[model samples]
Target: PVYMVYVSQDRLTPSAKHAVAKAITDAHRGLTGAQHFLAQVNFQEQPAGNVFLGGVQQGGDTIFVHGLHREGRSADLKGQLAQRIVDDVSVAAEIDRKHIWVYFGEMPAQQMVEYGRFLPQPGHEGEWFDNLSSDERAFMETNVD
Candidate 1:
């Protein structure tokens, strides 16, 4: 199982980011079945565009955390993750409970794809299709036939 965790706040102050990161990391330590963890913090200094209609808006930052574990781990671990985040950030960053939000996504093997070879390609041209080269494409096309 894979868990994608996102934590975001409305303010971009140093304290806010620190609070969120600390909270998430603290929670990460308590995760029962997580085998691997990769967490990222994103700070958006400006409004993300068209926020009034329901966008994340300005003065907000986003944190993305990815965790991998055995099957059925999420049901047992989700609550602990949420509680740790709420407690840690609230105390460290002074973020109000209402202003903080965390989302967890659990995905199975069939729903995920690895792109180890795709990251080195340059420019936006290869951004999405970088994982498939011309030869690989031809091979897949012929093999599936």
Candidate 2:
């Protein structure tokens, strides 16, 4: 659940922030079928000079999003996620779609853990979830679903 969004100070109005974040969370869960709680979103607002594109600092309207996710998703799925984020952010943040960028990096599934168990490979999520203790499964489902 490592999603980080970078923007310049004052670029995101209070409402815009929730709109974009909600869009991202929904996109992740709907596409990846991951648990809702696993779609964490974090925002980092930087000063103008702190962000640059092609060696030139960007203005306040630019949005950069990075996601570190479990490995094994198809390239096509990744592309869809990127497009979804860019399109959603453009509308929600009230900026040109081209100004939004999204990137995803992968880590081996076994390297990450949630609920005290290593996350499963993409298609094995159901199996892993079912193996958890009954109390744990109930807790996870109640909290996230």
Best by TM-score: 2
Candidate 2 at residue 118, lDDT?
85
Q: lDDT by residue for model 2 over 90-139, one digit each (tens)? A: 88889998788888999999898777778889889778877889988877
Q: What is the C-alpha lDDT of each candidate?
A: 0.46, 0.84
- Candidate 1 C-alpha lDDT tens digits along 19-96: 655555556645642211223344444343322225545333333345443234446567777667666766666645
TM-score of each: 0.47, 0.85
Top lDDT model: 2
As a TM-score, model 2 comes out at 0.85
Error of 2 at 101 (Å): 1.3
lDDT of 2 at 41: 80
Off by over 4 Å in 1: 1-10, 33-37, 48-71, 109-145
